[PDB]
Amino acid sequence: QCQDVVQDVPNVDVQMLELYDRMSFKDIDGGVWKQGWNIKYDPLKYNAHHKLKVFVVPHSHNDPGWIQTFEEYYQHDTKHILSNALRHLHDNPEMKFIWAEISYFARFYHDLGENKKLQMKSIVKNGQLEFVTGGWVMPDEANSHWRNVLLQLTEGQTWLKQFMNVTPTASWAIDPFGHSPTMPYILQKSGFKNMLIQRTHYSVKKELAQQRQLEFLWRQIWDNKGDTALFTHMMPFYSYDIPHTCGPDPKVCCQFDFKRMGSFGLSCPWKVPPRTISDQNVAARSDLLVDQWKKKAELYRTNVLLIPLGDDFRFKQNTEWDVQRVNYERLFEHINSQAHFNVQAQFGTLQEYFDAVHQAERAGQAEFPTLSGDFFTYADRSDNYWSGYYTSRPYHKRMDRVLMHYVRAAEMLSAWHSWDGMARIEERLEQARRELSLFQHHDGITGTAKTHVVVDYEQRMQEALKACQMVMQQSVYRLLTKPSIYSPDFSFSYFTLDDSRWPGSGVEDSRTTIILGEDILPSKHVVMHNTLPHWREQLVDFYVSSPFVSVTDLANNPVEAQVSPVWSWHHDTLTKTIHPQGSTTKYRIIFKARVPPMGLATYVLTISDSKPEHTSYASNLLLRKNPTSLPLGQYPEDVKFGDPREISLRVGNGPTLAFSEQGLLKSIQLTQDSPHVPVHFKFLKYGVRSHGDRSGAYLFLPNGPASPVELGQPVVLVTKGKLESSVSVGLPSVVHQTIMRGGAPEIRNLVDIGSLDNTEIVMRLETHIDSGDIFYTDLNGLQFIKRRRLDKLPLQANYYPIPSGMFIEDANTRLTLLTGQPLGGSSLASGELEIMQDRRLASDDERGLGQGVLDNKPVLHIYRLVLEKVNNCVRPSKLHPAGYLTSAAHKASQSLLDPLDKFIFAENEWIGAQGQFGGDHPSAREDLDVSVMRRLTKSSAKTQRVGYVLHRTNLMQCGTPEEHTQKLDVCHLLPNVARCERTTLTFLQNLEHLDGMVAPEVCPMETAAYVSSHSS
Template identity: 50%
Template sequence: LPQGQLSILQEKIDHLERLLAENNEIISNIRDSVINLSESVKDGQKNPEAINFSQGSVSELFPSTSVLLAVDSEDCLFASKTGGRSSGVQMLDVYDILPFDNPDGGVWKQGFDITYNENEWDSEPLQVFVVPHSHNDPGWLKTFDDYFRDQTQHILNNMVIKLQEDNRRKFIWSETSYFSKWWDGIDSQKKHAVKRLIKDGQFEIVTGGWVMPDEASSHYFALIDQMIEGHQWLEKNLGIKPKSGWAVDPFGYSPTMAYLLKRAGFSHMLIQRVHYSIKKYFSTQKTLEFFWRQNWDLGSSTDILCHMMPFYSYDIPHTCGPDPKICCQFDFKRLPGGRISCPWRVPPEAIHAGNVQHRAWLILDQYRKKSKLFRTNVLLVPLGDDFRYAESSEWDQQYQNYQKLFDYMNSRPEWHVKAQFGTLSDYFEALHKESSLSEKSSNSFFPVLSGDFFTYADRDHHYWSGYFTSRPFYKHLDRVLESYIRAAEILYSLALVQSSKSEKMSVFPSVDNYKLLTEARRNLGLFQHHDAITGTAKDWVVVDYGTRLFHSIMNLKKVIIDSAHILILKDKSAYNYDTATPFLKMDDVQASQDSLPRKTVIKLTLQPR
């Protein structure tokens, strides 16, 4: 090469060597920071007051209490053990023996004709728990915010008013994402009323995750994270911890979710969307209630009692019994003159003295037939549908007419029935008592099942499998946000400790960045909703989800930059927070929620950086 080109090449080599030296120094500083942090943690364990996060009001954002989760010894030893299957019902075996045909079952199209002897309940009355609920999708046909504005806030506002009118009324709620948004906008008097309703057992939060998540496409990290986010909010604001799982709308069910619920302290749960052939088979075997055990568990430490709803849907026509034409007549929102009616063209009738006997007997017949699919005389009857109870009139229609039916049934001792409103936990508590679950032999009363409930089909071999891969761009964006959240949480925690040991605590944006972390976790949690990550929402709703994911990724990059800045400085006193001139740059740039990221190009010149 000519002498001039050799000189230029030598200069570039020298420049690269200087850059490598700078990088080595940065890595050395990070290593020193980690070592110092480890020593700080040890000091903090010996002396909890050694690390003080009270400055900057950041402590106000943390959960008020810490939660310690015990790891069962069996969870870590299963791989080293050998043995046969420990469950009585193996779903892989069930799939092998079922023909998956679809014969016409009569009024219960996907089932069979149910008969009973009227004297069956003479010695042990039928206990009926009617559980009012409203399924609120955090985005589907409308965006999360639009649903809240148009329907959800009115449901919760009416709940506070209507439950207080009669202490026999009950109601359950699942989605903490909606509940927290509503809570932030109500006054202290209404908040006090809600806490009293919870204390009195009239109102129950079920599952309590940020959403009711999909269980096929979601990563277990996100499933846990959205549950933590919801439970921390409930503990901080309501002082409660949910104990009953409620999943009526996810499109199939994973044993992983059952395991997470069990390890979160739940003892029972409910599922609905299971293949119709499996529901029919379980109904014939009376195995709709079972202990769900992990396949790898050779003991019983992962057992959680699960209730599978037997019929087509969670709406009112498919929950009181096998005949939707009859059950629809007891959805009093469909009374003549309303906006919706029964597709079977037999409308409901308002309950009065002249028809109460006939109407009570009509629905009791459905209750009895449904109870024949289960092993106890305790019956669960959900009463609700998507975004129900948004209007004050519906609360009156449902609660007043059902109370008249209950009062009449309960006044007829020869009918041998006790019917009432209840929460999900009311039902499971009665079930525990009925089946003597407190005894050592309780597991023998209900079968033990292992396996999953995929792939779901609701009718006519319509398999819900497309959502496993639909809208792959946003499924990928979900995983990207997950990785940014974990990286940002780690760096933020390290930076918070470092800043607390120096005079830079007030300079480091701990409060602002903690809020960005919380917002990111909630946006990730929102996307685990069974109409979000699945890709089953309308296009404009998907754009709203994508925008939330994108904004959180951008915000977390800021948290990472701010945290890494203070960590790599050997002299912490040199730290200076300036939003206009960030100390570091990320390695990729994404312009919008629907664009591909581009790698940042670093141009090397002879000029110093």
């Protein structure tokens, strides 16, 4: 049955948390291999019957945006690289090349004439040009959500299967800044057999090299059996460039980068240039090179050696192809013919390397260690930890999550039908998937690109959001209009999306007001979509032009509602205060929407001349010295004023929250009789070093622990309502808001770091939870991994990615902070959680970007804060490397990442309107998600195919009795099912033909993909 992911600690040879606990981290000079040691080998190890097989693998690292935009690099560099690769490989049958970034390859191939397309297919089919990974990009592994890692992998691999007829089974990830086990998780479930990584902490490379544990079977941290394992090769040296890939001495290896002799504007910083290989020097040069290779080979277990040959945007000039190829050919001819070397060297591909390694393994020549854990936080040298990019450009980090959800919702809503080509659904969805996929690049979501490139990514994502809205609104119109009345124009806007949290209040006034009035329009239909496969209730809000509005469902049942003012915060350069202004012309109506699994529900907002029976009005209290009036147009309740004071609020039966006089949480009381548990929010700032290394887009190099932000006497606004209450405070750089709807609070920070150069703003939580040095952070929204703060490491090393959540706990109490955006964070002392909000850095951090981070813009960060009693929960043992969310924390995370979508009907009357869609959809167990629903066929296909990715998380058992729930069989969601197949996660290979056309549900922590086929 299902593996138990909680109670069995996997036995692995290397467990990265346990390795970290024992390892030294001292940064000692190792000699020519600066972060290693002087490698020694026995010359007699290799002989006539046991040769060293060396694969030199040419490559060219092509960033889809970094210092130039995607299109700029394509025009200036990549189109020439690919064009010359085509010519040289065609003309030189033994030459090889690997290619990773399918975004560029697709951009290129579609501009090729048919003759060149045929030539390209021929060098792929014959194995000279080999795709590695085959994702749209080589994604970041820290900030990226697993759903988008899968999206981009699928976008590239679908392209490759369609046009090149190949599916890579070896992955190549040489540049992401640290590595996540989410990659082997997804890859192994997408048909992969091998992967390669590079950017791991120098101390880890040294430690694994010493034990020859650089090749390992990487399994998930909870995986006791090992079925998730994927063979992984970690490169041993500081870089993937040529000086750091031939062997341990870059002064020697640089001499074998033949692009460094002068005419290309490159040189060797170790001051010895390459020399052209000739008959007079080939024996000497070969001796030097083979010595490097044999040293590198000492670090690995087989007689097969991988020698990458490339660097950033290499293999551009024709003369470069010639100078690398001809010189290496001379070396190979000499080396291979000289028996005393006992080497056979050739150009190869990545798959060739791995195939040969496994042949050696099968021959009993090596056994490989098992490993679990991750490879964060990376440092490339000294104390230069790359934790800055966990937060850099947080506006776009938040936008990634918004677009993530919009892509899912647009693909799901439109999947229910086949669409005529004229509707352009496929075109708009392809654009949206491609722009989101592009952003997963390790200079996109990471915030490590130049300012103008960040703008290009933002513009692309904005177009993607527009494409999603277009598809979603056409889909809603079709799903909720009587079929014999449905009369689409595919260019028309039937609904517009209303999104309360993006870009967010104080970021952009983008929200439409619903305009009602007795002399213009009495009522308006709104529709909510629920992408999750269970019935869901959530409060939703709309802006309306009158406070006297009531809500009904589409059986005309009254729905309880609350009206609140529209508050906006302003930095008053007159009074030098940050304070709220109330609209006199628009108001917020809030009500609970209840929506079917993967479904839609329609409500109606109707104006009246006086207070409606089922609508209540919030009270408002402005706490500040020297108040002035706050009129609210027609709003029926007068604003109250007071001097700053502590206050307490409770919505529904939910927790009671107490706040300081500065408007920051101080305690949470779960129930009437329970204790007020200290939980204190605080804002602090980190600075930058005046001496030595400066923080920049990649590096976090604080000048000591953070200092409290001086708050002064901030203005605090308290809104108290039956359905929703909140406390908001205008702090320097942050409007901080705590919202209560009757369960775990929502936190929203409108963060505007303004002109505070060399400042990183952090939000900290201080509690009495006896967490010690332990805390938990997630990896890619997929899993929670145990972290241990280590005082042998500097502060910035104890920062980890917080892509979706983090928690601390003791025997009795847990505090979980869920996020709607990836940010960096830590627990720097027992009982603390902290998460960086934004950072503004005046200096470059010497990794090639050539700028600081001075392009900040206001961003609305969102969170849920979940305090829970956990003494009754069945948790993993002390030695287990994983943690797991509770039901409430998981639901809270879903509320941030996949909220209900809200649609406002755009014209006066919707003829043929329907009340609901999806009422008959199964309401699946709470731990199960339909992560993806995507129709895979266009309308002309006789057999329609729809793909589903199902993910089951693992939630802690804490004694809440399990309810019923319906089995979800995705293969029967659409009618006329003719076949149901389990597939790889990319949908590209059929793995199992399913009995009865029934797709089984998956085990905890497992993800599966199914494709249903339908006669049409």
